[PDB]
């Protein structure tokens, strides 16, 4: 009845107010900056030893050690400077889709199709690695569980819900609801008081940790959203979708700024990441390659070729000196 | 220097793990509700035939949208598809599903084994007469007449039809796409067969043999 017509008028007011603050555009302001030029990078290392394809990877805080996951049922910790193997951990379930590394370097977490993000202890007194806790409160598979500190974690699942746990007692504290489809990714703000998520209903939301309520809703895409990440200064973020396009949003203006599309690309994006300064944007594709874009001008400036299957993960070190990419052909490469 | 030695002993253990991984023959089982998917075959199941190991999985623990988690099973040996071939009101739905799996982009090199269960029911329950054509699925009697096989000695011509019905439509979709990289192996079953572990053994042997003959320019 009137509950459908009333919501229609509210949507009109929000759209009308946005046009008032749309005086100029980002494209016509940065027209005096010199372009970057041409960026060339080449492979330096190749890590091999996994038995099947790779889904996830994560860098350490000290920027020397990283952890990777595979669906053969292993979890290997590498030494990037010398390509030495430090640890090897077998898992109970073969189907694993995510992994994380604790900021202090004492714990590692993982999860997958078994509806559990479990925690491992590394600094044991007996000389081995043992399981510490098991958190089970979800109904659908887990796609991302990320550490906050040494005592609490935040997870996203495929039942359209996020949660905040407490490792000491194993009971969750806060539940975030409001999405429509599966939640595919999340990203923490640098100040560690807000985070964003992207679901399969072509929208993104902004939450706050202390309260547990939604703040803003952004919508400019046409299909599912796969990747998301924050700007270095914590006032903007970028997304990637299945319509072969990346977009940039502003929190203060609550609207869109730029679009990164090309006429010869007809495949979706699987991962995005920023550089240390924030001027270059990296993206992985299903046509076996990766592209480098100029954030302030939206024109391509490079390419990385050499993988055999599609790239599934991508990361940049804390000090911004190297890039690591995984793929479905079970290899890891380090560029520059 | 002593840390390089430790790294080499980790690699010897990984070599022994690769020997067992290669001879395992993982399988995927997916069907529909009220299809008798359980009695024919608990996420994981183990069985051994002629000292050969098999491992089969069931993923009945999520919602009804499966366009995201189905991309994990892109390198299994085969897929088992189960159909409750006794009801006609829900038979058009079963065809659509098959069509989405066959034409998917990430599952272009995987073969499918087809089981047409619920045979004893259709022998007599529907033979008495409670359904016809143009009132239910109008494609099992579009003037069909096959002459290549008449098994089961002793019956009138319309016995296997209610299970023979489904055979043609799944072959219309199968033979119209896919050059030489995957095939289909239909089977007829029931609720008391004890030889279903042998049919999988034989059908998995033809998949490996056909793959080697093609790369030697012999097939």
């Amino acid at each position, epitope marked *: 009845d009137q509950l459908r017509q009333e919501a229609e008028q509210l949507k009109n007011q929000i759209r009308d107010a946005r046009k008032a603050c749309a005086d100029a555009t980002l494209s016509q302001i940065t027209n005096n900056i010199d372009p970057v030029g041409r960026i060339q990078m080449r492979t330096r290392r190749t890590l091999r030893g996994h038995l099947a394809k790779i889904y996830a990877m994560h860098w350490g805080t000290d920027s020397r050690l990283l952890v990777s996951a595979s669906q053969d049922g292993k979890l290997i910790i590498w030494d990037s400077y010398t390509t030495n193997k430090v640890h090897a951990i077998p898992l109970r379930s073969s189907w694993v889709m995510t992994c994380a590394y604790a900021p202090s370097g004492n714990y590692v977490a993982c999860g997958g199709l078994d509806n559990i993000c479990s925690i491992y202890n590394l600094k044991t007194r*007996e000389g081995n690695v043992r399981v510490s806790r098991e958190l089970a409160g979800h109904t659908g598979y887990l796609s991302c569980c990320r550490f906050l500190d040494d005592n609490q974690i935040v997870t996203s699942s495929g039942d359209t819900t996020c949660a905040l746990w407490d490792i000491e007692t194993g009971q969750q504290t806060t539940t975030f609801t409001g999405h429509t489809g599966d939640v595919m990714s999340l990203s923490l703000a640098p100040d560690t008081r807000l985070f964003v998520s992207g679901a399969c209903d072509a929208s993104a939301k902004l939450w706050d940790v202390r309260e547990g309520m939604c703040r803003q809703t952004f919508t400019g895409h046409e299909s599912d959203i796969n990747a998301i990440c924050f700007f270095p200064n914590g006032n903007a973020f970028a997304t990637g979708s299945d319509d072969a396009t990346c977009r940039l949003f502003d929190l203060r203006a609550d609207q869109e700024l730029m679009t990164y599309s090309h006429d010869n690309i007809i495949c979706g994006i699987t991962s995005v990441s920023f550089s240390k300064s924030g001027r270059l944007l990296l993206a992985g594709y299903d046509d076996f390659n990766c592209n480098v874009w100029d954030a302030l001008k939206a024109d391509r400036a490079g390419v990385l070729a050499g993988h055999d299957n599609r790239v599934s993960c991508l990361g940049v070190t804390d000090d911004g000196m190297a890039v690591a990419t995984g793929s479905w052909d079970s290899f890891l490469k380090i560029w520059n | 220097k002593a*840390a390089v030695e430790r790294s080499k002993m980790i690699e010897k253990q990984l070599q022994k793990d690769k020997q067992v991984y290669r001879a395992t023959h993982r399988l995927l089982l997916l069907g529909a509700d009220n299809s008798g998917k359980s009695t024919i075959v608990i996420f994981e199941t183990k069985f051994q035939v002629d000292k050969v190991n098999f491992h089969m999985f069931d993923v009945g623990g999520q919602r009804d949208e499966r366009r995201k988690w189905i991309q994990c099973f892109n390198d299994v040996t085969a897929i088992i598809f189960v159909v409750d071939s006794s009801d006609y009101n829900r038979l058009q739905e079963a065809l659509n599903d098959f069509k989405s799996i066959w034409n998917n982009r990430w599952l272009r090199t995987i073969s499918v084994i087809l089981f047409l269960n619920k045979q004893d029911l259709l022998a007599e329950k529907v033979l008495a007469g409670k359904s016809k054509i143009e009132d239910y699925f109008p494609e099992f009697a579009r003037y069909t007449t096959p002459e290549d096989a008449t098994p089961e000695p002793g019956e009138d011509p319309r016995v296997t039809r209610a299970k023979y019905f489904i055979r043609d439509e799944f072959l219309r979709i199968s033979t119209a796409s896919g050059d030489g990289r995957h095939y289909c192996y239909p089977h007829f079953t029931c609720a008391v067969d004890t030889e279903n572990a042998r049919r999988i053994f034989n059908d998995c042997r033809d998949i490996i043999q056909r793959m080697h003959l093609r790369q030697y320019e012999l097939l």
Partner: single-chain antibody
């Protein structure tokens, strides 16, 4: 985590005996092993090393050609067979464990000890001038352990360790690689140095750290200890 030794006694010169170090409570198969000898009134000495997987063995020059070291992982036991004994083998023995990867800490747990009495210029020399110093409760102290060679490697880190032995117990570890603090040690001990000179300082000393201190090096493989100093009143 336990280590116990069995054997020893009185043997005439020219005899033989076998020693055992039994272990329980940890993953014995992933740790190396060492043997350390202490005379009735002297410092510590290094004897032999058996790695993990038994693929590497080292011996001291003074006990070369007579001693043999071996291990059997399934039974969690260590052996040391000796032959052609003489008057210089009357000392105590210990069995020690170590592990090596990026960021670990070797020489962490020692044994208990057994008693057995019977009746060249390229090695680094570690010198401690301190032998006896007065101690008062709640003041600062300084001890130095210099060297005849540079202990800094061309990869970033130096190799120096510190040990503490109480009047009636086995030694334990305090600091590894000149800067780190061992687990379970209070936050009162600090270490610093540069290349050849190293120091150890204590802020406010209680009555629970009276004993002797040692330093060693882990750069060249024949391992050398120090003379030691006493923290008596």
């Amino acid at each position: 985590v336990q280590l116990v030794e069995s054997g020893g006694g009185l043997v005439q010169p020219g005899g033989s005996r076998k020693l055992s170090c039994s272990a329980s409570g940890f993953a014995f198969s992933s740790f190396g092993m060492h043997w350390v000898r202490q005379a009735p009134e002297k410092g510590l000495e290094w004897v032999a090393y058996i790695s993990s997987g038994s693929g590497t063995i080292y011996y001291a020059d003074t006990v070369k050609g007579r001693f043999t070291i071996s291990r059997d992982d399934p039974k969690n036991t260590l052996f040391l067979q000796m032959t052609s004994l003489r008057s210089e083998d009357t000392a105590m023995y210990y069995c020690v464990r170590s592990i090596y990867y990026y960021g670990s800490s070797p020489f962490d747990f020692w044994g208990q000890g057994t008693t057995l009495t019977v009746s060249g210029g390229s090695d680094i020399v570690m010198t401690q001038a301190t032998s006896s110093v007065p101690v008062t409760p709640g003041e600062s102290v300084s001890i130095s352990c210099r060297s005849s060679k540079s202990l800094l490697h061309s990869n970033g880190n130096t190799y120096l360790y510190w040990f503490l032995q109480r009047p009636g117990q086995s030694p334990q570890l305090l600091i590894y690689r000149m800067s780190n603090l061992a687990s379970g040690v209070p936050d009162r001990f600090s270490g610093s140095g540069s290349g050849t000179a190293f120091t150890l300082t204590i802020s406010r000393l209680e009555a629970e750290d009276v004993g002797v201190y040692y330093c060693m090096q882990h750069l060249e493989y024949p391992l050398t200890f120090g003379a030691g100093t006493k923290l008596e009143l």
